[PDB]
Paper text:
A HEPN (higher eukaryote and prokaryote nucleotide binding) nuclease [name] and a polynucleotide kinase [name] assemble into a tetramerase responsible for rRNA maturation. [name] and [name] are highly conserved proteins and have recently been identified as core enzymes involved in processing and removing [name] spacer, which is a key step in the synthesis of 60S ribosomal subunit. Recent studies have demonstrated that [name] is an endoribonuclease that contains a HEPN (higher eukaryote and prokaryote nucleotide binding) domain responsible for rRNA processing. [name] is a polynucleotide kinase responsible not only for [name] nuclease activation, but also for nonspecific phosphorylation of the 5′-OH of the 26S pre-rRNA produced by [name] cleavage, providing a signal for further processing by Rat1-Rai1 exonuclease.
Author numbering:
A (entry chain D): 5 to 77, 79 to 103, 112 to 162
B (entry chain B): 60 to 132, 134 to 143, 151 to 187, 203 to 351, 353 to 391, 394 to 411, 417 to 500, 502 to 589
C (entry chain C): 4 to 102, 116 to 164
D (entry chain A): 60 to 147, 153 to 187, 198 to 399, 401 to 500, 503 to 588
Write the structure that this text describes.
């Protein structure tokens, strides 16, 4: 009988509804980020109660990165760094289950592995590339975890 | 393949107690829980000698830890008056059954039942079981260096006045066995009897401190087994870090260690000798924490449990000792046992391990009223006001005590449970009381339900108890023990099936 | 033999030394100190636009932006600031070790990298300590040496 | 140790040209710059048959690249050959004549001491009799120069694709490979094969979406070029090869501005479909050095964007899983093999491709004296019609006082914006700084890259060193300026000829 931070499993459904209201068109651009903020707060509350599965915490981090990368209009270095770190943490936690064959086995696409290496060992990836990688990973979590629940 | 001496027709089987007459060349290892009195002779256990005259001493040694050798090796001045039909051999040990109500962990936990005394030639069934035939159970055996280094502190304890000691090592280095040996060595009734002052600064794997305590404990009596923090020695205060490791709040941990060293210096500068445990960190920021500690304490000795090290060399005198060390089977899983047995103790050496639900629970009001004035979240303080109230529920929070003038402070939102900000929390002084497990919370009635192990009604005048949620986790066995998955229909209050 | 530097006449490194690390660290106003910090970060961005800058200087620019963020935190969702400071430390340390602690890099940074990359996200206080340690490190190893 | 048949061919030295009479087995590997016609027979060069009648061809084969074989093995089999004989011909196979190019591009040792012997004029006592010094001469004795020859499958795929160009139906091609995989050699071979004299003289449409290692394109361009005349050597993108437009990405790699890169590629593909639908121009594409990751994603997006009708991959790997097998070919890398000293690094040869851009008087005239002595071509700044605004492509956030210093002594692209498109939206002010966000929306035509020298602050006038250029006469088309990522070679800021000339503390260099 494993422990769940949420009282019922129904709050996972509500958390998915906040992340993915599924009426993406058409809703207000600031209502979507009002749902995203409530969902990030629920994720951090669940994390404070008990450990959360890496996908759920990662979805919170990636949605925070999405809000900052969409709200951004100046000195872009910190916005670059936040999304960069979010993607590196997401990819590393996904891969930290035990190198090219490993990415195919976990089904993580190649652009993420290149993004992590470029951010760790090379110059900061372009903010336009950070948007691409964040949206790709947010699609990844839908493709793997969130659709089933 | 450790074994103990086996005697036939010499030992006597008695009701509630067993007496062994050990020959001169005999040794005993005993698994379980037992009060150990000495009838005739002197029994030197774990490198220190105990005679017949000493008052009876109670052992709690589980399967996880190594069993302390009980040697019969002999003659000393009296003093110790030996006190049975036959004198037999030189030494006659008397083992008393200790109704500690352990072995009841099996009711809630399936695997933990094998740690303590449980039966699962002709041998009766008691809470102490001597391992006559050789088994996989380990015994406390330490290198001669381990013994003489820890004994060189005892001679300097014998004369005036006090010593400050540090112990540095990794999580698996074995600082716990070292520190228990040292207290056993100085508190032996063959030297100065004044109580040692023990400072335990490790929240992850603490001893003489409940789960998530920084605690300065004046140890007056010896804990002769690897007590799991179950038995309490008179300590001035716990300090609830709330986190497994000092990494999570380095500033809170530092300000708390510094404030504990204040009382340590006030009571040690008073002939009592100080003694410190340090976290399992030897790498990274932990080395810096140890260096900052050494500078402040100015210890007379320092002990490191490995080889590596240059930073520690400055400037306090440093000793190098090999790690050695040792089932549990996991050390982090033993943290759950230390957390659970805290809530299940009526009094020390008595543990009723039926789930806490059935017992009448306790009421408090999370409002301006004197019940609980405020709540504060360590770590993530950005928890939404509407979400903190559900965040605390079904977790083990730590309730504090504050002065009314300090209690006034600024709490933030009167509605539901008033959150007290962490920034205001750190500034004001707090006195830890007890760890609280909150059963449920009534939104409509504003009264929330919590379990705490034992308490003195918290009688006080406008002393606002402040609740604190750390990082410490709730053992699954309290919400979903197999007893309360069948006594109440399998539902999902916080638990889900695999 | 000749090498190309983005700064004209190579006296603007002296300017960055005083602009990152002003003469007085406590009598100066913190708002004006952060204005000086922001100006230095803007100059480092300009030199990055001109050409490649030494990894120490880019790391100084990133670390001081992270410092300004950490010390100006007003509370709330600290997910962003923790992530950004963790990434800044990771870039700094990796760029140092990319070309033992022979470089005199403290073990705190290496432990921080493992904590942030693989382990749980480092806390705000730990990030504040680590960024200040890095800012001290770059000063001691590169910034004090450069003079006029 | 490649070598050719020593001669000993009754060759006459001439003054500016050399006459060669090659036997049937004779072949040539020639290092240097030279132009050749054929006086007798049909010389076969790198897998195509060139007879005597074909117009003279111009060779820029560099020491960095491999040397195209010049065979005379193929016996003249067609009447298209037009042989003119003024000497001797004598019935000994075929005689070909090659003339000095005099491109003056060899004079690079003035700026760089390492770029010597890339373009040879014998840079050491003479060991052979009757030796002569020209801008060209074949290596009679064996030497460490790789020749242009590949496995029979490499030439077989290209040849098989070639007769598919012989008939009416048109061919669109994709080429995919990593850096040093050999995409450049593959494309030069394929373009040489499609423009052989036997095939119709119909210009190929060549699309080059590679900014890092471009071909038929100056440094940092995306370029579509209708190639009507083949470039018989590894012209380091240093020949005209008339192109419709050279699109300034401004960056070495796609990753820096992926959205601008994709928009530019899609626009260039649309411009190619304006003319590739006509079916005369066989469209052909190069792809960036990225073989995996987001580069593979860009390649797949291109493949679904341009109806491929052919795809070539240079390395075997996860491409077959990633790209649906829709016909694609598989050819092994067979990358050019040479020493780093002989074959300079791609980042080290981008500096040459950038320097020779500003140092070219004409297509084949190269004056490599430092640019400082030439007149700075003063231009205006501000709201003035000369040059209006500045756009930093990536580092958009820059202090409004700092961009003007930023563009000083750096390579910037001068664009063209017509009518009020520039008016779409800072402070002018020292410099307007048109934002990048409004830049992307506006349509721009790329004028030649500009080298900035000595920004003047007291006056809006700023010096601009740009290569050969017609007068920028525009009714209202304001020539805005942008700064990308393109690097500035040291040799045109500070070479020996100007460091020794001055020796004082120069502004942007340290010693």
């Amino acid at each position: 009988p494993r422990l769940t931070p949420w009282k019922s499993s129904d709050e996972v459904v509500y958390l998915k509804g906040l992340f993915f209201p599924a009426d993406r068109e058409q809703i207000s651009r600031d209502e979507l980020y009002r749902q995203y903020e409530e969902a990030i707060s629920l994720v951090e509350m669940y994390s404070s109660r008990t450990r959360v599965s890496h996908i759920l915490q990662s979805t919170a981090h990636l949605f925070s990165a999405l809000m900052m990368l969409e709200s951004f209009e100046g000195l872009d270095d910190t916005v670059r760094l936040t999304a960069s770190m979010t993607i590196i943490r997401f990819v590393n936690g996904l891969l930290d289950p035990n190198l090219h064959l490993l990415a195919k086995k976990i089904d993580l696409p190649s652009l993420f592995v290149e993004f992590r290496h470029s951010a760790t060992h090379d110059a900061l990836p372009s903010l336009e590339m950070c948007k691409t990688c964040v949206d790709r990973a947010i699609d990844w979590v839908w493709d793997h975890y969130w659709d089933g629940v | 393949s450790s074994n103990f001496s086996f005697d036939d027709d010499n030992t006597i089987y008695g009701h509630d107690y067993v007496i062994f007459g050990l020959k001169s060349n005999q040794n005993l290892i005993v698994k379980g829980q037992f009060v150990l009195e000495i009838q005739r002779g002197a029994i030197d256990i774990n490198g220190v000698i105990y005679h017949s005259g000493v008052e009876p001493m109670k052992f709690i040694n589980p399967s996880s830890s190594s069993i302390p050798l009980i040697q019969a090796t002999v003659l000393n001045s009296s003093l110790l008056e030996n006190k049975l039909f036959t004198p037999g051999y030189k030494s006659v040990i008397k083992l008393t059954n200790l109704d500690t109500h352990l072995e009841s962990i099996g009711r809630v936990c399936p695997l933990f039942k094998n740690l303590f005394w449980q039966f699962d030639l002709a041998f009766s069934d008691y809470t102490f079981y001597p391992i006559t035939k050789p088994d996989n159970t380990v015994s406390v055996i330490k290198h001669k260096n381990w013994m003489d280094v820890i004994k060189s502190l005892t001679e300097l304890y014998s004369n005036d006045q006090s010593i400050k000691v540090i112990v540095i090592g990794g999580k698996n280095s074995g600082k716990s066995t070292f520190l228990r040996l040292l207290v056993q060595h100085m508190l032996s009734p063959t030297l100065q009897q004044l109580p040692i002052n023990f400072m335990d600064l490790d929240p992850g794997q603490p001893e003489y401190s409940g789960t998530d305590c920084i605690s300065l404990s004046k140890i007056s009596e010896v804990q002769h087994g690897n007590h799991l923090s179950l038995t309490s020695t008179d300590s001035t205060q716990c300090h609830y870090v709330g986190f497994n490791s000092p990494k999570d709040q380095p500033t809170r941990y530092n300000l708390l260690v510094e404030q504990l060293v204040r009382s340590y210096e006030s009571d040690g500068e008073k002939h009592e000798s100080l003694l410190i445990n340090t976290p399992g960190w030897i790498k990274g920021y932990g080395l810096e924490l140890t260096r900052t500690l050494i500078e402040r304490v100015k210890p007379t000795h320092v002990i490191y449990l490995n080889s590596g090290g240059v930073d520690i060399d400055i400037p306090k005198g440093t000793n190098l000792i090999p790690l050695q060390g040792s089932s549990r089977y996991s050390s982090s899983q033993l943290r759950l046992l230390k957390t659970m047995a805290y809530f299940h103790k009526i009094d020390d050496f008595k543990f009723d391990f039926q789930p806490l639900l059935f017992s009448p629970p306790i009421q408090v009001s999370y409002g301006v009223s004197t019940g609980i004035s405020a709540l504060t979240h360590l770590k993530e303080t950005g928890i939404g006001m509407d979400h903190l109230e559900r965040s605390i529920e079904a977790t083990i929070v730590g309730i504090f005590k504050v002065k009314r003038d300090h209690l006034e402070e600024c709490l933030f939102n009167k509605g539901q449970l008033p959150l007290l900000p962490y920034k205001e929390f750190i500034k004001l002084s707090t006195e830890f009381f007890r760890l609280a497990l909150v059963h449920s919370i009534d939104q409509e009635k504003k009264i929330m339900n919590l379990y705490i192990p034992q308490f003195r009604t918290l009688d006080l005048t406008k002393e606002a108890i402040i609740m604190v949620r750390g990082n410490t986790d709730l053992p699954i066995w309290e919400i979903a023990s197999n007893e309360i998955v069948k006594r109440f229909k399998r539902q999902l209050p916080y638990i889900t099936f695999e």
